[PDB]
């Protein structure tokens with residue numbers, strides 16, 4: 001029960017850093033693209049830039065939404081009618097942050113599936129020219145986090161407000177903690193916690209993900225206490 | 231009996247080590263992958279426009295200057311542009327440097343082993359890629375990484391106070407290590423008696439009067455290099 005919380009804590013520690021450093025590369029690419037677009041944002045620059053393989057092979061899609069609503073994405077995608085990037089959560093989030101941010105998951109305007117977007121504003125001479133965004137798949141992140149097994153439980157992502165952001169259990173996504181654990185609702189603080197999910201007793205531990213811009217997200221470990229102690 | 235007990239502890243410990251090495255190995259892979267993709271975007275951008283304005287403005291962009299000590303373009307005709315700015319040594323030719331030759335020998339993005347900086351005479355690692363426009367190679371982009379930086383990434387976690395991590399080539403050249411004296415020495419020079427072998431996975435060896443357990447994990451997705459993550463565990467403390 002002690003040597004346990006010595007390894008639990010240390011999993012979350014490097015696991016959190018793994019997801020931290022996976023993300024960090026993608027954020028740099030989004031920021032570098034925006035900084036380029038600040039100096040040159042002509043249409044052929046924009047398309048050339050977003051066609052570049054470093055982008056395409058890193059996010060589902062990479063795009064520029066401009067302050068006049070003009071939209072350019074890569075790769076090509078059939079587009080829904082009445083689309084306006086300025087209305088979208090990556091756009092609003094980025095303008096609010098005045099810099100790099102990560103959306104909580106929202107319903108993609110094209111696929112109607114959930115995604116997360118890393119975005120930032122394109123800004124030149126105290127003018128917002130638009131926002132750059134890069135789309136990342138939830139399942140692609142469930143994998144990065146649930147990369148390890150010892151076989152007792154799984155990992156997932158939660159906000160400092162209890163909103164479940166990523167998960168191996170597809171139903172859990174975007175539900176609060178109080179709606180998965182209504183009795184003995186686990187505090188998202190330091191330490192460990194006990195709760196019953198589906199009828200089994202499970203330990204729950206939280207680790208801060210360092211270095212995520214403009215958000216406060218936690219790695220969550222969920223163990224079966226029975227299997228763990230045995 | 232002592233044989234079956236000590237085999238259960240060794241096997242338990244080896245399991246823990248193998249999964250510490252897997253995730254630490256992923257962490258440095260991702261960290262390195264991120265710097266290699268930033269050098270590739272910088273080169274693909276330059277391929278489309280390499281005028282002196284554009285080059286200067288691009289290399290000054292904060293995403294580059296806060297990730298690398300220096301970012302630079304060396305061109306086939308030997309012209310060199312670096313930001314941040316630096317006093318430069320006489321005779322400098324970018325095309326003679328390890329980063330420039332490696333990249334062109336690689337055909338794409340690669341990583342150098344530690345080499346001596348032409349400017350600071352100190353050991354650095356460089357992420358680099360050729361600038362390719364219409365089949366041609368206009369030059370090479372390089373991004374500089376400090377060794378203390380990589381030592382920190384791979385030593386994030388303490389392995390229960392059991393030991394530490396370093397990086398080593400497939401040929402046994404210690405590339406990055408918490409003890410400066412070890413950098414660029416060989417496993418043969420540091421463990422002259424029972425030199426750990428990289429293919430074996432778990433080796434037992436002796437350093438500074440204590441028995442260490444050495445474990446090696448491939449790092450995936452580093453173009454043109456074969457580096458391993460190495461853990462060194464104090465055997466006695468680990469077993470205890």
Ligand SMILES: CC1=C(O)C(=O)CO1
Pocket residue numbers: 061063088107108109110115117135
């Ligand atoms: C189509 C794509 C989605 O991620 C949005 O809703 C904005 O860019």
Ligand SMILES: CC1=C(O)C(=O)CO1
Pocket residue numbers: 300312327329346347348349354356374
């Ligand atoms: C400035 C730059 C360094 O990384 C070298 O030592 C060669 O080019």
